[PDB]
């Protein structure tokens, strides 16, 4: 039984290993060395925060691309107001080590979590106007690494328990919840449609879960070092992967394998963020070299580095309009660059 | 500048007192994060320092000053991951369960893994040696030697500049000493001095247990200061 | 959430008076209060504002030196001291809760406020007082103001109050983007200059004085007010 279902599983393996490299049939590359070059991308800061205490460790944009929701690893959640930069809300969290943070599509909620295994949604639009404890679900045996919205009710979040689980607010329980990986899930990334999304754990492999049904439609294998950060492109047909190992990977849904692999020799240190523009073109990553780098998704070559910041960067994220692009480090200060 | 944007700017002012007003005890108080197994009196430990949530924070005040110390053990067994977040804090607290010997391994391998982490690489890494009356009874018993598990044991001389404490056998100190030098030689390789463990051999009663942590880190705050003042 | 005012009655000229105002339901703290007065057989008129943790206090040309306005945050309460009384002053005042950050709805909470009887700035004017109608047909109010409310942030600083038989003024608009609690049926439409409410479907509760405002410069001045009858 176990030896016959161990050869199995390494038959099926096989089998799905030349399957993808049967439609491997060229590299991005080959086919991204015509389209003209893209040049340098050279992004100045526009806006300074100076608010946050202890090193931010999240960050989101939401509907509304004025309004920007970054946490401090002191237990306090921010929404900055990134044309005037003023603080539009303030939120102190029961949770010092808080990792997630993210501003749901209707403006009037905002979840978070981390450490304490209990994710955290509070409202924004309360008739009583002070930030109320909203929904405090917890089930979870493990940190929380990251939080995305769905809709006004349901919510999707990944834990250091190896499974992600996507949660309803008004019941306050798992709506679903999916097979457990090898590791820690570390974090996800909604598509367009919201109906599937794909997460990264520990394990160097990332799995393509469905919001209808609780199985992973694609699992990709190909990394040496744990995933840090994904975030889905603009279409949802790809997604890029990075890793501790200064390397991004670009996979795709429909082939079912890497296209781009976005390294340098000169970059040692591990990647901590992952993001794209409106268009896709500017993949944007976060390093732990104390300044992020933008590269070309189609030339992978380097389009632009913000060396603004005096920390190692934790998070970024693109607005929905691409207007900027926020950088939060564990500097306690946000940088938004355009 | 229209009114409504001088309010939101009035709001945001307000909200800038609110945070300074709470980094001002941020900063006055001193993060420490306790990591230790199962075996290990972690959890006799904070019942003792008295002066499904996966984080236990408790601040207790020594000497007029603040400690939060983070207790850890509601998680997975792994925690290469999570442990990053906790750079830049005064301490860590490491238990071990000094007495039993087969978990002895385990807790060597814990402390270097901890010990040689890129991120925990400029924190130190306090050292509690607890259930020091049980390994005083097992030791003296003679029914478990430590020689069984490590053969370091039978060729190990009594250090002799060691510092016996009233009353206590030679088997004792011998067993005692000999694991806190394993332990300093765990700590000490790779160490370049930026970190340094301080171990100390800690009773299930003894009352003197924050003052541990507060002597260990007014050394190590002074060691921390004396390469960012230009002092060494 | 409640704002209940008292300390209204009768007072000789020349008298004082302490109008206060209980809040509860919500931080009073993070709100600022404005003091409005109507006077009797008449629309609206701000008198004074209070910003959150008294950092800034505003009054109207006309009601300077005599209110001032103060607000007790350890009690949730806010005072208003008149001095120095004069004719005139006969109307009822009330409170109102405003929170001023993007995409909120300043003055979305109007207090039942309290009567109190004796013995430059932007203006709004409204073309027409009372309009009939009925049920099931749509009503266009139109407003006319004489500086251009558009602002260089493009915020449209207008604000819509309906008062009904009884009740204070309610927040329909304070922004086209419609207020909490208000159906659908109110829109808001037109230029920096000249404005539109659009009533799609009228219902018996709509029946009221609407009220426009201009938020562009501290100092407020509200309209004549249109109204709607049965």
């Known amino acids: 039984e176990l030896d016959q279902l161990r050869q199995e599983a390494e038959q099926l393996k096989n089998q799905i290993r030349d399957a993808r490299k049967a439609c491997a049939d060229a590299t991005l590359s080959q086919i991204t060395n015509n389209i003209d070059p893209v040049g340098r991308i050279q992004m100045r800061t526009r806006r300074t925060l100076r608010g946050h205490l202890a090193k931010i460790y999240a960050m989101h944009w939401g509907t509304d691309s004025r309004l920007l929701v970054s946490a401090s690893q002191d237990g306090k959640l921010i929404i900055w107001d990134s044309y005037t930069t003023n603080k539009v809300h303030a939120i102190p969290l029961r949770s010092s080590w808080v990792m997630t943070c993210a501003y749901a599509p209707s403006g009037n909620y905002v979840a978070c979590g981390g450490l304490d295994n209990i994710c955290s949604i509070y409202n924004l639009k309360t008739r009583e106007g002070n930030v109320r404890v909203s929904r405090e679900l917890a089930g979870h045996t493990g940190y929380l690494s990251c939080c995305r919205f769905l809709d006004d009710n349901q919510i999707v979040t990944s834990s250091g328990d190896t499974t992600c689980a996507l949660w309803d607010i008004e019941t306050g329980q798992q709506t679903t919840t999916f097979t457990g990986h090898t590791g820690d899930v570390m974090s996800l990334s909604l598509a367009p449609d919201t109906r599937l999304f794909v997460s990264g754990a520990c394990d160097a492999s990332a799995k393509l879960w469905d919001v209808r049904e609780g199985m992973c439609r694609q699992t990709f294998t190909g990394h040496e070092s744990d995933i840090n950060a994904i975030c889905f492109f603009p279409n949802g047909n790809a997604f890029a992967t990075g890793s501790d190992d200064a390397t991004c990977r670009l996979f795709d849904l429909r082939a079912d394998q890497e296209l781009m692999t976005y390294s340098h020799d000169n970059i040692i240190c591990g990647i901590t963020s992952v993001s794209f523009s409106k268009s896709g073109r500017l993949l944007l990553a976060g390093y732990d070299d104390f300044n992020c780098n933008v590269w070309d998704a189609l030339k992978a070559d380097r389009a632009g580095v913000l060396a603004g910041h005096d920390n190692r960067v934790s998070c970024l994220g693109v607005t929905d309009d691409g207007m900027a692009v926020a950088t939060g480090s564990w500097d306690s200060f946000l940088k938004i660059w355009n | 500048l229209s009114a409504e944007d001088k309010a939101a700017v009035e709001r945001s002012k307000m909200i800038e007192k609110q945070l300074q007003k709470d980094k001002q005890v941020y900063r006055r108080t001193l993060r420490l994060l306790l990591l230790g197994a199962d075996n290990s009196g972690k959890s006799t430990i904070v019942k003792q320092m008295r002066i499904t949530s996966g984080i236990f924070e408790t601040k207790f005040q020594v000497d007029k000053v603040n400690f939060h110390m983070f207790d850890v053990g509601a998680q997975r067994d792994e925690r290469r991951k999570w442990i990053q977040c906790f750079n830049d804090v005064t301490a860590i607290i490491f238990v071990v369960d000094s007495s039993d010997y087969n978990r002895l391994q385990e807790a060597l391998n814990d402390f270097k893994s901890i010990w040689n982490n890129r991120w925990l690489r400029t924190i130190s890494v306090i050292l509690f040696l607890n259930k020091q009356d049980l390994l005083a009874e097992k030791v003296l018993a003679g029914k478990s030697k430590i020689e069984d598990y490590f053969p370091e044991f039978a060729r190990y001389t009594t250090p002799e500049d060691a510092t016996p404490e009233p009353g206590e056998d030679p088997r004792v100190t011998r067993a005692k000493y000999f694991i806190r030098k394993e332990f300093v030689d765990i700590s000490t390789a790779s160490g370049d001095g930026r970190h340094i463990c301080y171990p100390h051999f800690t009773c299930s009663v003894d009352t003197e247990n924050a003052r541990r942590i507060f002597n260990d880190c007014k050394d190590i705050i002074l060691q921390m200061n004396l390469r960012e003042y230009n002092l060494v | 959430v409640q704002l209940v005012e008292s300390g209204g009655g009768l007072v000789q000229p020349g008298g004082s008076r302490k109008l206060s105002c209980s809040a509860s339901?919500?931080?009073?703290?993070?709100?600022?209060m404005h003091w409005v007065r109507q006077a009797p057989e008449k629309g609206l008129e701000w008198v004074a504002y209070?910003?959150?943790?008294?950092?800034?206090?505003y009054y109207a040309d006309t009601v300077k030196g005599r209110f001032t306005i103060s607000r007790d945050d350890p009690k949730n309460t806010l005072f208003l001291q008149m001095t120095s009384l004069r004719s005139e002053d006969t109307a009822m005042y009330y409170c109102?809760?405003?929170?001023?950050?993007?995409?909120?709805?300043?003055?979305?909470?109007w207090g039942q406020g309290t009567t109190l009887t004796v013995s430059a700035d932007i203006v709004m004017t409204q073309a027409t007082s009372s309009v009939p109608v009925t049920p099931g047909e749509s009503v266009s109010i139109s407003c006319r103001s004489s500086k251009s409310l558009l602002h260089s942030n493009g915020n449209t600083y207008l604000y819509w109050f309906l008062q009904r038989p009884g009740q204070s003024p309610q927040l329909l608009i304070y922004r086209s983007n419609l207020a909490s609690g208000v159906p659908d049926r109110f829109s808001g439409s037109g230029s920096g200059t000249a404005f539109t409410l659009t009533i799609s479907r009228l219902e018996a509760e709509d029946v009221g004085v609407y009220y426009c405002?201009?938020?562009?410069?501290?100092?407020?001045?509200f309209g004549a007010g249109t109204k709607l009858e049965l």
């Open positions: 109102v809760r405003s929170i001023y950050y993007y995409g909120s709805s300043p003055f979305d909470f």
């Open positions: 339901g919500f931080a009073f703290s993070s709100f600022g």
């Open positions: 405002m201009q938020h562009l410069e501290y100092p407020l001045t």
């Open positions: 209070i910003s959150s943790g008294s950092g800034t206090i």
